[PDB]
Amino acid sequence: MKRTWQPNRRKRAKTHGFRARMRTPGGRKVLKRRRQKGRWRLTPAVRK
Template sequence: MKRTHQPKKRQRVKVHGFRARMSSPGGVKVIKARRRKGRRQLTPTASRRAA
């Protein structure tokens, strides 16, 4: 049986990336909360090649 986690860089960015977050009001709240908390990385980012 195949494992459930089959990571793909492009898909990760499309779903959880900065532009995806900024496209909805809830996502903007997430970014604001992470900025307020002082997170070093606001969203998962991929290399130029993957995205």
């Protein structure tokens, strides 16, 4: 049957993307934390 992951590149960038995170207090704290932890990718990788 229809499962829960239905990938959609535009939906991905517009929801979790860098510019979405930076718009918002919570989103900037996400990037701070990812950077502080040393994450290699601050944001999901999506192709455009």
